[PDB]
Each structure stands twice: as C-alpha cells, then as structure tokens.
Amino acid sequence: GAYKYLEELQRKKQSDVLRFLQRVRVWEYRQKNVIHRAARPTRPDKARRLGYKAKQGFVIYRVRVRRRSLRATAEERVGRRAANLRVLNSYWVNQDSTYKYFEVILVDPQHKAIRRDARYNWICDPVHKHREARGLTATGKKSRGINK
Amino acid sequence: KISYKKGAASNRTKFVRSLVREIAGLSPYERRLIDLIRNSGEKRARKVAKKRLGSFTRAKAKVEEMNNIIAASRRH
Amino acid sequence: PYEPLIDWFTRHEEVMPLTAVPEPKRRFVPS
Amino acid sequence: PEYVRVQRQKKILSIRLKVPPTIAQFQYTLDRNTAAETFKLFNKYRPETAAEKKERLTKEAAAVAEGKSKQDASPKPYAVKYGLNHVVALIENKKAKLVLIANDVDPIELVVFLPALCKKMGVPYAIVKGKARLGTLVNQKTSAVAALTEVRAEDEAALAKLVSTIDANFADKYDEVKKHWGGGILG
Amino acid sequence: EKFEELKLSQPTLKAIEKMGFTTMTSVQARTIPPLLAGRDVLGAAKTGSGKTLAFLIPAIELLHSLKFKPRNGTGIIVITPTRELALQIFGVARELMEFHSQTFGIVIGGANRRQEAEKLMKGVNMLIATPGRLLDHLQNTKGFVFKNLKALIIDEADRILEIGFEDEMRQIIKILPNEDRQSMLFSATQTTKVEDLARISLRPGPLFINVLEQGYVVCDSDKRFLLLFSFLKRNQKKKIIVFLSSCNSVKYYAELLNYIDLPVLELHGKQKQQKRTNTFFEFCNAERGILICTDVAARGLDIPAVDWIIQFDPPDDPRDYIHRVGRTARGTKGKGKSLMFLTPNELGFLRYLKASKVPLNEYEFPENKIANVQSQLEKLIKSNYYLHQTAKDGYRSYLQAYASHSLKTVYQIDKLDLAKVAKSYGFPVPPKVNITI
Amino acid sequence: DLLRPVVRAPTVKYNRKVRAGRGFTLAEVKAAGLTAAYARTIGIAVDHRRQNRNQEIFDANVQRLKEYQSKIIVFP
RNA sequence: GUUUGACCUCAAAUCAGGUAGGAGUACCCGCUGAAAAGCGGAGGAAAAGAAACCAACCGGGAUUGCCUUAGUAACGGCGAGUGAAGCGGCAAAAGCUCAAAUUUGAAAUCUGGUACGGUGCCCGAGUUGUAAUUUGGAGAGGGCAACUUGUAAAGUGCCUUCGAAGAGUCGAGUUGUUUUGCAGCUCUAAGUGGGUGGUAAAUUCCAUCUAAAGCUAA
C-alpha cells in the first residue's frame, strides 16, 4: 500500500518538497480562520495510525494556535467549539514563527455508523465526553506523564 | 525472543529510503556540507556536521552518507 | 543558490520487483 | 467571498515561488489526441457499475432459481483498476501495463512518488490532467489514478502501440524539463 | 546378505520395504556393521551408491536407542557441499523419518533465513546442511540446542575441498563438541587436507574400506528452453535424457511437457524412490522416451546407451562430467551423442573444455525454425494457478542453483539478464527471489 | 477462581520460596496437548510474556495441569 | 464550443434528523494557584491498565487497593526535618482492537429516505479505502493428512516460498520551572536500528524491552 511512501516521505520534512508544501499550506491556512473544517486529512497516514476512518462520523478540523501544551490547548479549542463531537486525537501538520498548525480528529457519537460498528461504539459512552478537558488524550497522557 | 523489528534491513526498505533521499534533494546545511567537504576536507566537514548535530556518531554517519552521495554522483 | 537535481540513482533500473509475495489462490478461481 | 478570493489567490503564489522539480513534472502532461485515444481505449474497459453488477447478480440468481436450473463457468472480467493503494499494489509485481496519474490532487504528496516509482520500475506511466475525468470513466467522483493490467487480445496491439506512443511523447519530450526547477516567476 | 535380517526397528523395516531395498552394495555391507558398532570411519565410494541410506539407517537406529525429544537435542548433523545433493539426501530421508518419530529440516545457502531460524528454534533432530550456512547458524541463532552432537557426517570431502570451504569446517569443528560426537565421512578420493580434517574429526582410530566429440549449443538464455522443446519434438521416437540442476525445474518441465502431450518421464529427488525406480525401468525398457533428470540423480545410476545426452542446466562438477562422458563413450558401443546448452556469457567453459582437450563441435541454431509457443506458454501461466506456482518454483530453484554454483568465473549471476530468464520460464516479469546479487 | 501456575520466586531473600503465579506459557499448555485459547474456556490462566527457564518448575506445573485435566468433567 | 458538461470549493435554507450548554459537585480527573480559593469535565465510580516494566535471582510478569518493605534508601544552611521504591502475604483478577504488504475472479462496506429491529427499492457516503483476515504470543499463501464443530466457517501435523509498522519524533544545545521531569527557542537522526541497565582476564561481553497510536470490568 502507498501509505508507507507517505510515512517515509513525511519522515524527511525539511527536504525541499515538503518544506515547499509547508510554506504554501501555512500561507493558505493563514488566509483562513483560526478554526475551520478540512474536507480530507492532509496527512492521511498519520490520521490512520492515530485511528482515522474515511466514513460518515469522522470530522477533520484544522486549528491554528499562537506559539499547558500547545497541542493540548489546540485540542481544547475544538473541544469547546464542537461540543457534540468527541475529540479522538490530533497531530502536527504545519507551523509558522507566529502560529503552529494542528489537525484534530473528532468523532460524532450520534451518527448511527459510529453507534453501530462496535469497533467504535466505545466512544459513545458518556464517560469519554471531553477527553481533552481531563487530559485523557495522547498529549494529555504525555503531559501527565503516565507510563511504566 | 528477538522482535522481527530487530532482524535486519529489508531490500524494500533500502530501496525506499534511497528513492526518498533522491526525490528529496539536499538541505541547505547539506548543500553546505558537500561544498565544505570538497573544499576543506573531511576533518572540517565532520566538525561542522557535529556542530549542526548533537553527538559525533550521527556526525560520522552523516559524513559517510554524504561521501556515498558524492561518490555515486560524480563517478556515475 | 539553486542547482539542478542529479539523477544518479534513477538511471539504474532494477530488473525485478521489490517483494516476492506468493500469488494467492483466489486470483485464479471464480470469486 | 473569502474562498473565491483564496482559490484565485491559489495557483498565483505557487507560480510566484520556485516549485520543486518533483512538482511541475505535473502539468507537463499528455497532449490532446493522445489523451483522447487513451480515454477511447479505456471506455471499452469501464468497470461494471453497482447497478449492472446487481442486475447480473439477480439474473444469475434467478438462473439458479429454476428446477431445472442452469450451471455454467464463465471467463475472467476485464476492467481498469483505480484504487490508490491497489494501484501501487499492482506496481511492485509488476502488473500495470499502463498507469494514468491525475495532476490535481489536493494532497499532492499522495502521488509525488508514483512518477519516479514507475520510472525506475519501467511501468509506462503517464500524467493525465484532471482527476474528475478519471472518476467519470470509473463510476466514481474522482480517482486520481487509473491502472490497467489485463487486456483482451482485441486491444493488445493497440495497448502496445499506445505504450510506445506515450514513451515517445512523454518520456522523451519532458524528461529534460522534468529535470529543472519550475515556476519562480512573479504574478 | 540383505537389509532386512539385520536388527532394525519395525518402522525402519517398513520404510526400507516401501523404498524397496532388500539387498545392499558390497562396500555398504562392509561399512554397515562398523556403523552399528559406533566407531568413526572414512570411506571411498562412488557417488550415489546408496551411501546416503547407509548412514541414514544407523543414525535412525541411534535415534531409536536414545528416544530424545525434539527440544532435548539436535543429534545428527550432515554436511554436504552442494544444494542438489543436500536436497536429494533430504528427499531420501524424508520417508525414513516419516515412519520414525523425530524431526527433519534443511539449512541451505539461498533459502529464507527466517524459516530455518524458526525451525532451529523449534529444534531439528536430523540436520542436513551445506558448509557455508552452518557458520552463520551457529554464530547467530540464539537458543539453538547445540551441545548434544550425538554424531556428524561429511559427504564427498573432495568436493568441499574443491569449493574451498576447509577454513569453515576448521572453525565449525572448533565450535563442535567432540566427546559425544562420532564422525563418519565418505569421499571417493582423498588428499592431505582431507586427511587432516579426518584426523581432527575421527575421534577413535578408524578402520576404512576402499573399493570424443561434444556438442555445444550457444543458445541465448530465453530460447534455450523453447529450443529444447523444438529439438525434442524433432527427435521424437528417440530415447533422450536431459540433465537439469534443480529438482523443481525437472518437475515443472515434466508436467509442462506432459500438458503439451508429449510423453515424458521425470526423475528428480523429491519423487518417491519407488516411482523413481519405476520411471527408470520404463525408460530402460521402452527404449523410446524422453527423460528429464538432475545431474546427480543421473550420476547415482548407470545410464542405458542413449540417443542423446543433453545438459540443459549448468554442471556441478565439470571434471566429473568430463569423466562421465569418457566412460559413456567407452562403455556404450552404440553411439551416444552428448551436447550441452550454453549462454553467451558461458564461453569460458569452452576454454575449460579445451583444457580437457577432448574435441568440440558447434551445432548451429536456425532462427527460422521456431516453435513459437511462448505466447501460449504465457497464456497458460496466466490461466492456471498450479502451472504458475510450479514455474515460479522451478525458476526460483534455477537461480538458487546458480547461487550455489562453485566456479564463479564461468557463471556470474550479474551477467545473466533476469527478465530474459523469466521469459524463458514464461514470465513477462521476473518473480522476486531473495538472492544475493 | 481460575487455576494458576506454581512458580519460582525471584531475588535472594526468597530464592528458596515458591509462589502462585499468573499464567503458565503457550509452550507449556502446548505440552499439555491443548491450546491456550481453548485452555481459557476451561479456566486455566495463561501468560504470554513469561518464559519457562527452570526444568523442575516446568515439570511440576505440567503434572499439575495433567491432574487438573483429570479432575474436570466438561459439559457439551 | 462565445455552448454544454465533469469535478472541487463555498454559501443559503422557517429543508429532514439529532446533538452542546444550566443546576449540583461528598468522591474522581486536568489547568491555575497564594497567604486553600478559583476554572474546566464527567461517572456511579472515576483515573490507571495489559511493559520501549521490575530485576540480577534457581528470576517475576496488566492495572488497582490493604499489611509489610519503613520512618529504611535517598534528600535536606545533611538544620527544621522531608521521605520512597523492588520483592513478599492478601483482595480481585481479563484480556483485547488498530495502523504495515491487493479482493481485484467483481466495495464484498454503511448513513438516510420510502413500502411492508428486519427485509426490498432508491438516493447517496466511500477507492484521497468502507468490508473480511492479520496485531509479533506471530501471521499470511497454498498442498497433504485426518479429524472436530452450503463445494459452509474454524482447529491441529509436515514441505516450500514470503513474513509490513508510529519523525519536529528519539536525541543534542540553550532558557524558565520542578524534584529527575515538564514547557518554550535553534538543530535534528538511524534500521542485523533504537532505548535502558550491568560488565572487563577491556579493539569487552552478554542482560532486558520495542516508544513516538488506542480500548478494557473487578
């Protein structure tokens, strides 16, 4: 599958091609708001290994944050904005000297596709509501420093 | 028990990384390091590489990789 | 500055594929 | 509007700044007639729609219905193939006697490797222009890739000659200008 | 005497019966009671006289006597130079051990490292291996049960010395335990370094028993199989034997030709030895048949006076081929014409032929008279899964046999164009094989 | 309660001491002639990250599994 | 062809269906924080949770809580005094799911509407990948052998070939904070790699896991 090639092309970020894509996409997002929706993940490999599935009930938001942690705060922004959505996880996509750009994956527990497909029904439970608020996300656990 | 991650580098992997580094090009510090090699020798090349990096083993790795680039480019 | 990119490794052509996956049964029998 | 302004501002800065030579391999694409005959070739190898699939399925299920049913063996289907990871999968075998790569993909990094991959593998790849038209010939909105492996004898000569043609028009013409930095002129 | 009177386990008796051997060869008769006595020994025997069975029976007797579990130890080690002989020995031993309770495996240069690594992790009670890969196994594999060494064998020491692996067995035997190990070895001839290795190996004092024009067809690498097919069609109704390298190639070509409906007999190691004897019997009695067999499987038995010797695949020991053709010429009063296929990279072999000083004849190939079946071969391979897999296995074993070849100056895998070999087997594109290139 | 391995203790203060463990191994349950997955449905604990390194502990827990198999009657 | 149509993107809905707030807050989880207060978020519990673990043994084996370890180790104008953890006994015990190679001999996936949770038909979503199978304890492909539970699904013995994994991350410099960790700025790797920890009769050895993703009752 092609997603490997995405992974190892992403591995070389400061290379000419990906720095060019960084520098065009940073500007293009700069024209856009602080928070807004993306039609598709710009790093689909990262989204999958963080748990993305391309079907109804998976929402992509691009969040802009000024330079707690920046990733956690960015997650909290969409947490307040999209209360109905539940924050799954986020990842880094782009940055600027003025702002850092992150892509967050949110899941709707109301769409029957998520409510069915018992692989993901677990997020429908009320106990998972606002994981980012309680630091239960990946960055939340990392900042809390919970490991063995 | 030794994890299969431990075993070795598959042919697909060396192929993939060679193809990536080809299509990526050379970074401005790398574009520097090639000229610094060609001009003032591997000693100063290693010094500058280690200053750019943190440790020395990564420095020798980088210098050896870039000598591979220089050799496989100029002669072929 | 800028310089053109060298094609020193693309010019070598491999005569074989990367992976020797054994062909599965289902590709030859009706599904 | 904001987004009309953005999209009109998009494609200006990209040409304003120097695109990497791995890009601008795109938009140095197949000429008019050659794309036209490529699509005429493909339109014989449209994949079966979900609707046609279901019609043949109910037909054959009804054929099994009879007492006095009928049992037969049928040959392989023939169609283009279009899914991205599947397209790369038919590469590294190799099986793609042809691959078409759309130029306009918003995550271009999904496709930047495909030209070099098929170059080194020797698959006769071509950069088609417009993912939507690939979608039209494949019962999809968009495809971004179109690989073909198996071809009937009635088109095999056409396939081979088109392969030589694309080798003449794309690999020969644009390899030296695939080989330079594009863009960089202000707008 | 016979094999069956000697004290043997019932499963070994059944295996011997189903492989059909009742009598023994005289030298094997001399060596067997020594093998039961447990003394070390060196021996001179002709290649393929049944000496493989001669050690397989008493080693399995030892495993009857000890009854140790697969995890407890590995026991018997077998060292054989070439991949072909190792595979033939494995195929001979597979049934003998299938009636018996212990475990078998292969350790060969060119096979997947991970398969054999996992097998060594599980443990193998009868190891059969080539000299080169055993060092890697003993130095790299962890937890491999090695301390036992109930016994060990070397086969045809002259050939390993010719290959140049003497350092490797010195290193191994330094790694090997000795007090539990008992060494038997077989080598038709001997040299001083072979005797040195024997002195290091044989723990007690051993008692030993000691008892022309050629065609060359320079055919380019792809049309050689099809040229064989055409030449075979033209010389139908003449009994002909073809020498290959890999048993897989023999098998695949056999049913390939059977599908094209020309009668063929197959004689390769993987077959059961009774089907082997039967096939040789119908070949000898019919007097008009195509036979496809490996170099060493042919070596192990005498050849009836034949219309054509062809060697399709490269030889294993070219010196033995020169002597074999000499003996065939002086033995078969009926003229047996011998020819070898070649590849344009192989012309060095011809100068080696000039070193043999025997005369040589060029047999020309007309580009007009071509079967033109390659498209049909491609369509068949695309159609049938079974022929697909068998062609792939034969091709894979062909390249692995090239990897195991000794004389590199005459055969370099780099010289060979692999797309074109793949076309020879009927693949447009080479299937990948893990081979060091 | 689920049946458990009798296991050897670590350290030197209790090097002489024997304990109740978590699970046997895959290798040991295979030596029992049954599978770990099916052995779960019977109420036998299984631990995969553990390794068997002592012969006597292994043999004792094997005989323990034999007597467990003997005393159990399973309903279809 | 100045036409028409494929997409992409964006708007607008008194279009259809849902969802967020607020109160309380004894317990729980994050942020902030003085000489606790405050903020944010639930639930009946919550959190954590199946080793990039602990150890050096004759090794142990998710997490959680109690006794002990123990007022010991360690820390501290080594002053005030601060203050653990392995292991062991006990309670209760639970293991699982992704992401990496193709189904390509047929997206096999699913929301919604409609006629009778299900079934049909139709819109759609989706190949920039929904299904099945595989999470390293391996697993996959076939073939042979038997078994055991509509050319149905699953388990085991043997031969051969294959056998794919978390990067602005690891790490390094510096600044602030904290008692080693955390946060910011410059830099940024490798794959028989990497991390951690012992070890010399030292051009050393072997020891132990696999991060940069996720769920899980008691």
XYZ file of N, CA, C and O (backbone and C1' of nucleotides) in Angstrom, chain G residues 67-135:
483
model
P -2.164 -0.133 54.871
O -1.608 -1.565 55.296
C -2.017 -2.179 56.511
C -1.196 -3.409 56.816
C 0.315 -3.225 56.801
O 0.818 -2.682 58.009
C -0.256 -5.152 55.558
P 2.126 -1.748 57.996
O 3.288 -2.716 57.495
C 3.701 -3.829 58.274
C 4.686 -4.690 57.523
C 5.920 -3.975 56.999
O 6.930 -3.841 57.984
C 4.997 -5.334 55.290
P 7.859 -2.532 58.015
O 8.764 -2.670 56.711
C 9.608 -3.797 56.518
C 10.074 -3.902 55.087
C 10.799 -2.683 54.540
O 12.173 -2.682 54.882
C 9.146 -3.388 52.995
P 12.830 -1.430 55.644
O 11.735 -0.997 56.717
C 12.105 -0.251 57.872
C 11.224 0.957 58.075
C 9.817 0.662 58.594
O 9.391 1.714 59.461
C 9.670 1.762 56.512
P 9.456 1.527 61.056
O 9.441 3.017 61.621
C 10.645 3.764 61.770
C 11.176 4.237 60.440
C 12.159 5.404 60.507
O 13.108 5.286 59.449
C 10.287 6.037 59.229
P 14.541 6.003 59.553
O 15.483 5.083 58.658
C 15.725 3.728 59.007
C 15.842 2.850 57.785
C 16.513 3.476 56.571
O 17.929 3.461 56.651
C 14.528 2.382 55.897
P 18.788 4.675 56.042
O 18.622 4.515 54.466
C 19.221 3.426 53.777
C 18.919 3.467 52.300
C 19.283 4.755 51.578
O 20.655 4.833 51.235
C 17.098 4.100 50.965
P 21.469 6.197 51.475
O 20.694 7.275 50.594
C 20.727 7.224 49.175
C 19.711 8.157 48.565
C 19.795 9.612 49.006
O 20.772 10.358 48.303
C 17.580 8.878 49.233
P 21.532 11.576 49.026
O 20.418 12.709 49.150
C 19.812 13.269 47.995
C 18.623 14.124 48.358
C 18.923 15.340 49.223
O 19.359 16.455 48.463
C 17.095 14.149 50.139
P 20.594 17.354 48.964
O 20.019 18.126 50.235
C 19.028 19.133 50.083
C 18.435 19.537 51.410
C 19.417 20.017 52.469
O 19.798 21.374 52.300
C 17.899 18.476 53.432
P 21.332 21.770 52.023
O 21.523 23.148 52.800
C 21.525 23.194 54.220
C 22.525 24.200 54.740
C 22.943 24.058 56.204
O 24.049 23.186 56.410
C 22.273 26.292 55.781
P 24.057 21.657 55.910
O 22.710 21.034 56.492
C 22.070 19.947 55.832
C 22.008 18.707 56.688
C 23.325 18.300 57.338
O 23.071 17.640 58.578
C 22.647 16.621 55.814
P 23.565 18.294 59.960
O 22.471 19.407 60.278
C 21.109 19.055 60.472
C 20.307 20.214 61.009
C 18.796 20.029 61.011
O 18.350 19.326 62.160
C 19.351 22.158 60.110
P 17.082 18.341 62.087
O 15.831 19.326 62.062
C 15.581 20.227 63.131
C 14.494 21.208 62.768
C 13.227 20.601 62.183
O 12.325 20.129 63.174
C 13.942 22.398 60.821
P 12.509 18.676 63.844
O 11.201 17.875 63.407
C 11.239 16.909 62.366
C 11.459 17.556 61.023
C 10.985 16.772 59.810
O 9.590 16.886 59.589
C 13.162 17.599 59.413
P 8.764 15.662 58.952
O 9.162 15.689 57.410
C 8.807 16.792 56.590
C 9.364 16.653 55.195
C 8.996 15.376 54.456
O 7.704 15.422 53.878
C 11.313 15.772 54.231
P 6.716 14.164 54.022
O 7.489 12.980 53.286
C 7.801 13.056 51.902
C 8.776 11.977 51.496
C 8.410 10.563 51.922
O 7.490 9.942 51.040
C 10.641 10.998 52.533
P 6.539 8.759 51.565
O 7.511 7.502 51.647
C 7.360 6.401 50.764
C 7.993 6.671 49.424
C 8.038 5.486 48.471
O 6.826 5.310 47.760
C 10.175 6.484 48.577
P 6.087 3.883 47.754
O 6.994 2.989 46.797
C 7.219 3.370 45.449
C 8.420 2.668 44.867
C 8.466 1.161 45.054
O 7.647 0.445 44.146
C 10.538 2.060 45.677
P 7.089 -1.013 44.541
O 8.311 -1.980 44.218
C 8.922 -1.944 42.940
C 10.070 -2.913 42.825
C 9.751 -4.376 43.062
O 9.059 -4.989 41.991
C 11.773 -3.832 44.140
P 7.742 -5.858 42.296
O 8.257 -6.993 43.289
C 9.320 -7.858 42.920
C 9.875 -8.593 44.114
C 8.868 -9.397 44.918
O 8.589 -10.658 44.338
C 10.191 -8.108 46.388
P 7.087 -11.222 44.326
O 6.786 -11.510 45.862
C 7.598 -12.416 46.590
C 7.223 -12.462 48.049
C 5.744 -12.581 48.365
O 5.268 -13.906 48.229
C 6.708 -10.926 49.743
P 3.711 -14.175 47.957
O 3.011 -13.730 49.312
C 3.022 -14.575 50.452
C 1.978 -14.147 51.445
C 0.590 -13.907 50.872
O -0.168 -15.090 50.699
C 1.203 -12.054 52.165
P -1.236 -15.180 49.502
O -2.312 -14.065 49.873
C -3.018 -14.133 51.102
C -3.853 -12.902 51.348
C -4.878 -12.564 50.285
O -6.027 -13.389 50.341
C -3.761 -10.595 50.953
P -6.793 -13.806 48.991
O -7.642 -12.511 48.627
C -8.552 -11.955 49.564
C -9.105 -10.640 49.077
C -9.725 -10.662 47.689
O -11.074 -11.090 47.725
C -8.293 -8.771 47.928
P -11.604 -12.224 46.720
O -11.729 -11.467 45.325
C -12.359 -10.197 45.221
C -11.963 -9.500 43.943
C -11.829 -10.396 42.723
O -13.074 -10.607 42.080
C -9.913 -9.005 42.911
P -13.233 -11.757 40.974
O -12.548 -11.122 39.685
C -11.898 -11.924 38.714
C -10.741 -11.176 38.108
C -9.915 -11.951 37.103
O -10.519 -11.924 35.828
C -8.484 -10.850 38.640
P -10.979 -13.278 35.100
O -10.002 -13.397 33.857
C -8.674 -12.883 33.898
C -8.333 -12.196 32.602
C -7.421 -10.985 32.750
O -6.625 -10.852 31.577
C -9.456 -10.299 31.810
P -5.329 -11.779 31.355
O -5.072 -11.678 29.789
C -5.790 -12.495 28.879
C -7.065 -11.836 28.411
C -7.169 -11.593 26.916
O -7.551 -12.753 26.201
C -7.839 -9.646 28.073
P -7.590 -12.726 24.597
O -7.033 -11.278 24.236
C -7.169 -10.745 22.930
C -8.168 -9.617 22.896
C -8.118 -8.732 21.664
O -8.791 -9.297 20.555
C -8.187 -7.377 23.592
P -8.206 -9.084 19.075
O -8.424 -7.530 18.815
C -9.726 -6.970 18.839
C -9.729 -5.562 18.308
C -8.821 -5.301 17.119
O -9.384 -5.729 15.892
C -8.528 -3.592 18.720
P -8.494 -5.721 14.557
O -8.365 -4.171 14.215
C -7.214 -3.648 13.573
C -7.153 -2.150 13.724
C -6.197 -1.425 12.796
O -6.802 -1.158 11.543
C -5.928 -0.636 15.026
P -6.142 -1.673 10.174
O -4.979 -0.626 9.907
C -5.248 0.766 9.919
C -4.005 1.555 10.224
C -2.750 1.125 9.485
O -2.686 1.656 8.175
C -2.262 1.482 11.781
P -2.322 0.703 6.937
O -0.903 0.099 7.328
C 0.264 0.908 7.340
C 1.497 0.080 7.087
C 1.409 -0.865 5.903
O 1.650 -0.237 4.660
C 2.241 -2.040 7.769
P 0.890 -0.777 3.355
O 0.523 -2.277 3.743
C -0.130 -3.135 2.825
C 0.869 -3.848 1.956
C 0.304 -4.868 0.994
O -0.328 -4.322 -0.140
C 2.188 -5.777 2.048
P -1.520 -5.163 -0.796
O -2.810 -4.686 -0.004
C -3.791 -3.882 -0.642
C -4.759 -4.715 -1.443
C -5.059 -6.113 -0.885
O -6.455 -6.386 -0.942
C -4.380 -6.265 -3.145
P -7.213 -6.909 0.374
O -8.358 -7.865 -0.186
C -8.148 -9.261 -0.352
C -8.709 -9.743 -1.666
C -8.041 -9.165 -2.904
O -6.928 -9.946 -3.296
C -10.409 -8.982 -3.092
P -6.142 -9.621 -4.654
O -7.119 -10.096 -5.819
C -6.898 -9.662 -7.158
C -8.172 -9.210 -7.829
C -7.973 -8.386 -9.098
O -9.017 -8.672 -10.026
C -9.171 -7.108 -7.517
P -8.768 -9.713 -11.222
O -9.950 -10.767 -11.064
C -11.305 -10.338 -11.058
C -12.178 -11.230 -10.210
C -11.600 -11.617 -8.849
O -12.653 -11.696 -7.888
C -12.090 -13.565 -10.071
P -12.576 -10.857 -6.521
O -13.049 -9.398 -6.940
C -14.396 -8.982 -6.746
C -14.742 -7.807 -7.623
C -16.084 -7.151 -7.317
O -16.030 -5.759 -7.627
C -16.133 -8.068 -9.497
P -15.539 -4.701 -6.524
O -16.429 -5.026 -5.243
C -15.962 -4.691 -3.941
C -17.055 -4.142 -3.056
C -18.068 -3.232 -3.748
O -19.339 -3.343 -3.110
C -16.907 -2.005 -2.095
P -20.583 -4.034 -3.854
O -20.714 -5.436 -3.117
C -20.756 -5.497 -1.700
C -20.106 -6.753 -1.181
C -19.798 -6.782 0.306
O -20.928 -7.111 1.098
C -17.973 -7.670 -0.952
P -21.825 -5.970 1.792
O -20.782 -4.865 2.266
C -19.818 -5.151 3.268
C -19.412 -3.907 4.017
C -20.548 -3.025 4.513
O -21.137 -3.495 5.713
C -18.964 -1.683 3.418
P -22.728 -3.401 5.925
O -22.993 -1.850 6.183
C -22.555 -1.229 7.382
C -22.656 0.275 7.307
C -24.048 0.849 7.087
O -24.835 0.910 8.263
C -22.544 1.888 5.609
P -26.370 1.380 8.170
O -26.284 2.960 7.989
C -25.860 3.789 9.061
C -25.988 5.255 8.728
C -27.393 5.758 8.448
O -28.164 5.967 9.617
C -25.932 6.591 6.800
P -29.745 5.686 9.584
O -30.284 6.678 8.462
C -30.195 8.085 8.633
C -30.677 8.824 7.412
C -32.060 8.445 6.908
O -33.107 9.062 7.636
C -30.567 8.456 5.097
P -34.511 8.305 7.833
O -35.218 8.438 6.413
C -35.497 9.716 5.862
C -35.969 9.616 4.433
C -37.163 8.708 4.192
O -38.394 9.332 4.505
C -35.493 8.228 2.604
P -39.559 8.507 5.242
O -40.168 7.602 4.083
C -40.616 8.179 2.866
C -40.767 7.133 1.794
C -41.576 5.908 2.185
O -42.971 6.112 2.069
C -39.560 5.223 1.160
P -43.987 5.177 2.884
O -43.839 3.757 2.181
C -44.536 3.442 0.983
C -44.697 1.951 0.835
C -45.174 1.222 2.085
O -46.584 1.208 2.195
C -43.246 0.147 1.234
P -47.290 0.522 3.462
O -46.998 -1.032 3.276
C -47.235 -1.941 4.339
C -46.359 -3.162 4.232
C -46.070 -3.884 5.541
O -47.119 -4.751 5.940
C -44.055 -3.584 4.349
P -31.768 -0.156 17.224
O -32.126 -1.607 16.674
C -32.791 -1.767 15.430
C -33.290 -3.176 15.243
C -33.320 -3.675 13.804
O -32.068 -4.182 13.372
C -35.416 -4.075 14.803
P -31.593 -3.998 11.848
O -32.460 -5.062 11.045
C -32.329 -6.452 11.302
C -33.318 -7.249 10.492
C -33.310 -6.976 8.996
O -32.302 -7.702 8.314
C -35.529 -6.885 9.794
P -31.646 -7.116 6.970
O -32.790 -7.305 5.879
C -33.300 -8.597 5.585
C -34.514 -8.530 4.694
C -34.392 -7.653 3.463
O -33.654 -8.256 2.415
C -36.450 -7.219 4.521
P -32.652 -7.372 1.520
O -33.616 -6.654 0.476
C -34.349 -7.429 -0.458
C -35.494 -6.663 -1.076
C -35.130 -5.467 -1.936
O -34.715 -5.844 -3.237
C -36.935 -4.912 -0.510
P -33.496 -5.085 -3.956
O -34.104 -3.665 -4.345
C -35.141 -3.556 -5.307
C -35.709 -2.161 -5.346
C -34.699 -1.042 -5.530
O -34.317 -0.862 -6.880
C -36.169 -0.486 -3.772
P -32.916 -0.162 -7.224
O -33.074 1.305 -6.628
C -33.943 2.242 -7.241
C -33.907 3.574 -6.539
C -32.528 4.164 -6.320
O -31.989 4.756 -7.483
C -33.790 4.377 -4.341
P -30.582 5.516 -7.394
O -30.972 6.939 -6.808
C -29.971 7.909 -6.569
C -30.286 8.751 -5.363
C -29.085 9.302 -4.614
O -28.524 10.446 -5.234
C -30.606 8.370 -3.072
P -27.256 10.299 -6.214
O -26.123 9.670 -5.290
C -25.260 10.487 -4.516
C -25.674 10.512 -3.069
C -24.556 10.320 -2.061
O -23.842 11.516 -1.812
C -26.351 8.897 -1.507
P -22.322 11.661 -2.302
O -21.485 11.031 -1.108
C -21.611 11.545 0.207
C -21.000 10.618 1.225
C -19.628 10.069 0.879
O -18.592 10.981 1.185
C -21.019 8.323 1.680
P -17.356 11.156 0.182
O -16.682 9.715 0.165
C -16.182 9.129 1.358
C -15.808 7.684 1.144
C -14.990 7.401 -0.105
O -13.610 7.638 0.103
C -16.784 5.864 0.034
P -12.753 8.550 -0.906
O -11.635 7.550 -1.423
C -11.950 6.180 -1.627
C -10.828 5.453 -2.314
C -10.505 5.973 -3.709
O -9.110 5.867 -3.976
C -11.253 3.719 -3.838
P -8.360 7.057 -4.754
O -7.791 7.981 -3.589
C -6.951 7.445 -2.574
C -7.004 8.266 -1.311
C -8.382 8.362 -0.658
O -8.248 8.394 0.762
C -7.618 10.526 -1.224
P -8.115 7.024 1.590
O -9.340 6.136 1.087
C -10.646 6.285 1.638
C -11.285 4.945 1.912
C -10.674 4.187 3.086
O -11.657 3.428 3.785
C -10.397 2.927 1.105
P -11.373 3.019 5.312
O -12.732 2.359 5.808
C -13.853 3.162 6.141
C -15.128 2.527 5.657
C -15.329 1.076 6.062
O -15.823 0.923 7.380
C -15.712 1.283 3.756
P -15.086 -0.071 8.407
O -15.611 -1.519 7.989
C -15.027 -2.226 6.904
C -15.937 -3.317 6.394
C -15.522 -4.739 6.746
O -15.940 -5.140 8.039
C -15.957 -4.614 4.433
P -14.940 -5.961 8.988
O -14.603 -7.278 8.155
C -15.572 -8.300 7.978
C -14.997 -9.494 7.256
C -13.758 -10.121 7.879
O -14.052 -10.992 8.956
C -13.412 -9.842 5.560
P -13.027 -11.121 10.187
O -11.637 -11.484 9.499
C -11.368 -12.800 9.037
C -9.926 -12.952 8.626
C -8.894 -12.515 9.655
O -8.634 -13.507 10.634
C -8.356 -11.571 7.563
P -8.102 -13.085 12.091
O -6.658 -12.473 11.812
C -5.589 -13.300 11.378
C -4.318 -12.512 11.193
C -3.908 -11.627 12.356
O -3.278 -12.350 13.398
C -3.693 -10.424 10.331
P -3.679 -12.098 14.933
O -2.987 -10.708 15.285
C -2.866 -10.267 16.633
C -1.645 -9.402 16.819
C -1.716 -8.422 17.986
O -0.407 -8.202 18.514
C -1.519 -7.219 15.964
